[PDB]
Amino acid sequence: LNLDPVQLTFYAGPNGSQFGFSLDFHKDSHGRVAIVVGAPRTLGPSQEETGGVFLCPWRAEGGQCPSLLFDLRDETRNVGSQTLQTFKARQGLGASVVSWSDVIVACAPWQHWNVLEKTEEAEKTPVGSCFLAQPESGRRAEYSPCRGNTLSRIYVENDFSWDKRYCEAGFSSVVTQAGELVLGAPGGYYFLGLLAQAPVADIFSSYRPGILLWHVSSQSLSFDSSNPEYFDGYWGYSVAVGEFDGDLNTTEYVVGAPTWSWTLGAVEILDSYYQRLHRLRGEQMASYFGHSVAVTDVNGDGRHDLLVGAPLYMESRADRKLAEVGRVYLFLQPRGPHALGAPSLLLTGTQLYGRFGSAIAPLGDLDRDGYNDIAVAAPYGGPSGRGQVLVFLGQSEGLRSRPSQVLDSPFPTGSAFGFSLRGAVDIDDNGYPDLIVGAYGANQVAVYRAQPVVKASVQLLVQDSLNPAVKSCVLPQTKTPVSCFNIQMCVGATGHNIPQKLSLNAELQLDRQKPRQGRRVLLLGSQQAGTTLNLDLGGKHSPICHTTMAFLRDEADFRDKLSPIVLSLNVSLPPTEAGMAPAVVLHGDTHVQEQTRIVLDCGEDDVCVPQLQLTASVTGSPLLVGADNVLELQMDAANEGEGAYEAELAVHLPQGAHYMRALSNVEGFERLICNQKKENETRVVLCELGNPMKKNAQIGIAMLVSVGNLEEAGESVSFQLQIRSKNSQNPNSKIVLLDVPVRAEAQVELRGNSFPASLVVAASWGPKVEHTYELHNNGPGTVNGLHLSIHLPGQSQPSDLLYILDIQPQGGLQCFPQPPVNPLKVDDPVLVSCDSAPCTVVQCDLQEMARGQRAMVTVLAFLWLPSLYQRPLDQFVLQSHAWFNVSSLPYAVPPLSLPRGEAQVWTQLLRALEERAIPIWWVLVGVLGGLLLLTILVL
């Protein structure tokens, strides 16, 4: 967090040369670490932009760089009928300047290559190169991996197979500590990408001066096939190396594909033989996931974690539906070969179009805390849109969501400050790793020299109570007895390479809350409430302890006997003298506060002897593994003795559980003051209880804690509950160990309905009838070995009024109905059911079913017209029945239920035929007949 921003060393370069596109350190044989700064478009011999590499040494002031000379002369040879050509123009020589112990491997990602046989040509393509330099005379060895001599007709006739023409094989590069050199190539294999590796010694010994096309003996190239997800994925945009499998000698690569799977992106972890081990897909489309990766061990556990940047991430804002901030993903390595989980931390930008996370560079341990830190850059971030670099500090759970330092851009707008970063290598032998950032807009490099860290540790040992009755001291220059008391302040400071002349100011405050004329405690020496004495701790590793003496004022001067006396201490660095430039950065518990109080109603002892009795109970006992369980704890705390000064309740939370809320049982503060303290070995929360409790004060606490997922918790978890007080005699309650047993479950809910459900039928395939018994797994955990046993009506024979066909499941089923369905093939209520009609024991079985999983069993059908054609005037009713169970489940104990239940999927059939009934709609016809008869009689 020290990166000193006031005094910078600015390395400048030629005008128009970007000089900062890429950087790297170089440690020579005789120490003397220099800086290798790449500079594309740095003109050249014939007034054309071919880039260049500048080997800037280290100096306090900083200035123009010497420059390292590489050959730029457009080589041309005739091997045979071939006319192998290379075109050294508009090559970004310096776009990546990675180095080894003695080798500089500056690469030119855009270099052209064109063989010319007779009239046929292989076409100008950006193959790339990687010029290997060597100080101490050295040789200009060149290593282009995919320089080919295959004509165009071969490529077109083979449908563009093994098309290494457009590698740009200098885009990314890292040199493994063994000595190999792996080069990214996003455009290889028709923009899929590849990775080419060759040992440094082999390429050094295999180079011949003037030789252009030669195959390295021990090289290898990654393979790529026709998976459509890989098309135009630019696999190789940024590479890195690390150790993931566990075998040290074996080495494993990390590769980013920012446009993998239709602009989604991914980052893969490979093996030295180019075999996949994992794959991490992005969160949002067009976010450029994997634009820049970085392998570092942030949490200090010995396993290499991972960080993946998404510069173009778009977030939701108040007045903007989607806002382009940028994101960085952190993945923590789990124990064993387990699958990498969800992103452990998500860091998002704040400035619009800031491109946050476009360059991530591990920083070593800036603070020398044992947790490796990283620096994340926003080239166009900041309030003014100039540039920024943000420093994050690693911790046990990962990083810190709040940037620990923000470095603004000294260069003007459009400088792209922070585009490229490097670190983790000391440059001035100060013992602290430094950071070099680049800004190709202004053609300059800013070197931030990390300042030494002073870890301050402060305590304040004071009595827990002051009795004004006793008088053991006298005021200076007088014979007036006073009630003196002892103050012991210890200020510590431990650091690596700290100046031997270190000074600190210790500011002591007594009765801090009360006003100046209302102070109760007064210093004996100066007779002033607050004092300051300089500390000369230079060269003192062990903390130096100083003691003083203070007293209590006269009775008539103050009227309060209940408000606590509060003392505070503050150690701060002296202000910088003429010249600014603070020597060191102070960090730690810079201030502490301690409290004291006059004795009250402690009886004859004059000390308030506590009697703490804590009884605890836990509700919602069943804890479920892999579930977001919430635990509500009820504790009744009652003090049976004298006043409990600074009473408090200590909950020994495990590493998984988290404190969420509280609630008292006495108005006062139902919501209670709780602060979680992480300084202990485990997580211990600090829920306040009252300062102090009176005699026989009974307080009830409602303690609701969200227990996290802890796989290694075991069968039961013991909760340690205690009451903490600052009293001298019996300052704690009895430790209550609350064992919380832990257990499992599967909950499949089955239903069914026909298609259609209700059905009127008539008075080669009939309608289908589905009994969709869907395995809706509401169970908490995954299940394995779920076998079902269903009883269907009818034995799939031609004789029934139906033809039960086959089914459409979702997984490994293989029930062969008894006897098999499709014996052929095909594509009044008469109850056709298992109880009345024949029965068919149908058994289909499944294995897995994670929490929430489902799938089912779909019944396809076509009705048998003739068989049911019977019952000329009856309307049939179709009924089914079903049963299921479980063989086993992958739990410690699944002691709840082998799932069981019965349903009946009905397909009601109705008879749409009827006759003519109600004497109504023919009861004027009868009267007309009557009238006819009457008229006949009258005639």
Added chain:
Amino acid sequence: GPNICTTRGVSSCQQCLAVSPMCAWCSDEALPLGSPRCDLKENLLKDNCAPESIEFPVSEARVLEDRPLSDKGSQVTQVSPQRIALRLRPDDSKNFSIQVRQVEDYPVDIYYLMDLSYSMKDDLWSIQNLGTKLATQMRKLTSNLRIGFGAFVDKPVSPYMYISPPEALENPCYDMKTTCLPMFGYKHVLTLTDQVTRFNEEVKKQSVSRNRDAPEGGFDAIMQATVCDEKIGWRNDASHLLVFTTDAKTHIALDGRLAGIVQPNDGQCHVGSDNHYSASTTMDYPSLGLMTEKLSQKNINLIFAVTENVVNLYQNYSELIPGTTVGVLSMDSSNVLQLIVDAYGKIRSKVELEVRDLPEELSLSFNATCLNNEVIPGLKSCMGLKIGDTVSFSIEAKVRGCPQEKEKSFTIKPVGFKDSLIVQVTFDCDCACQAQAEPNSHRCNNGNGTFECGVCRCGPGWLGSQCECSEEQDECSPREGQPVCSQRGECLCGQCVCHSSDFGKITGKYCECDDFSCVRYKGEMCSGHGQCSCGDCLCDSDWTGYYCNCTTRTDTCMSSNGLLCSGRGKCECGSCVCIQPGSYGDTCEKCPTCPDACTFKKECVECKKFDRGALHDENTCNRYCRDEIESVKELKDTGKDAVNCTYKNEDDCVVRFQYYEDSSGKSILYVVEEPECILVVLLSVMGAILLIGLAAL
């Protein structure tokens, strides 16, 4: 009795006004001492203070311009009222309503951004007679129509074009026996003209080109057609349509580093006098955010005309670009005209407000009231409209503390519409008495009396309530047994004067109340969407809950069905909670074992056709069921593609009908027009007739 106003501020009128919107201050000097000066206005009337002395600020939305909403487009006003003045009290709120109305006959502007890669040589032969056929099919929806044309392929740089042999720099199809045009990036051809005979006469002159990699430089053109409005010809009072036909994936920002160009797209207008993107080979591609911002600022609707291969990609893109619509285009644009017409229909059937330049102190929550009177809390949009439908939202505005500046303006507006409502906010954090305050010296202290309003505020560093006592008075605790000022304050001159904390300032009569003790989500109290008001979070108007999580916005819980969490669930805290048994999915869109569509919703042939049953007095007969009654006659499809069902109608006549789906969804009937179709009561009638005849005999 006691209220929030009396227990917080009596010292100053400003703090009394700021404590709660329901308080008010009386400054009558004739009020006897011992009565709460700050209290409720009703209590103040009961307090018998001077009504003239009472100052009760009221938050109000005074309408300023209220031109009636125009009915036709032959000036046109679509948002009413178009200018409102607000005077919000500290931590106050007040609502107002917009009346959006899509007006028919509104002039239409069309711009055609056609790709010209070699894969789209077949396409140029179908657009050769558009425009006029667009005019004939747009004259039924608009009188003033103007159209334009554009083109784009990709950036003219080495990894994307062919630069060898030397004769392939002017003919990128040298190897094949064709003559393609040199590769370009943007060659805008036509300005928007009312005449339609130029869109036909200029597409007869374009040709194709040939890049190398399959993705085409599409986003370079949707940045130059949007911005160069002086050359495109955008009108200020028309409907802007940007048709974007493509055949492959598209390059986005940072794709240019494969070629050397690393300069971000500024977003300004770079088209010169030659109608060409001059900075194509020196500037990067634009990201999605820049495109959305520039489209939103210029009121432009983007219509995708993509093919089947890439329709999923562009449908998944269009969710991040508000005001867009994808459409499956054939391999040779045989259906571009109908696609444009249907996209125009689909974009005019939705009203979505978008607040622009919103002050940091204001939050807005809406409550859509669309067709019928179905108020849907949370949603600030709704679908299902037709051209001519009026919507009436209901906005809620809240200010979190009176800001320093007292005049800000934002503009709620439907997307794609020039018309907007401009809000002139005027925060009111002032009091009358303290305005006319002068130092009345010698009232308190040794000739150091402070200003008026009945308070002689003692100078800082001087002890005394009314400058009375320095060192040596009454009880300063709610209870005798409780500590004085709750141990966070000092009671001098009988008044709890309390500490100053780096965390915040402690408030209250005894200042037993804290301003930073509120619950927090991760690092900040009230989840970052509320202010800690005396230990209880007062979340913004958008958010609600004990914590300030649980948003009230229901945009996430929205599906194409048109109901909150579909018709089978409910939405809480911005998430879709499934309620129907067997239901699941992202937004409860998947409830299987449930009764089929042709099971329950069959009364549309009972309420709508041959009206009978429920929904006769309830205005929901056609709101849900809106199936089109079409009468086909016995196709040879007696149930393969849908669910035909039959029920005996009111006359007990069997009616074989079929309604479900034909292509991804069809509220279309396939019903046949012509359907196909008791002793005691009988005896009793028989007997009476027998006896009735018996009397005749």
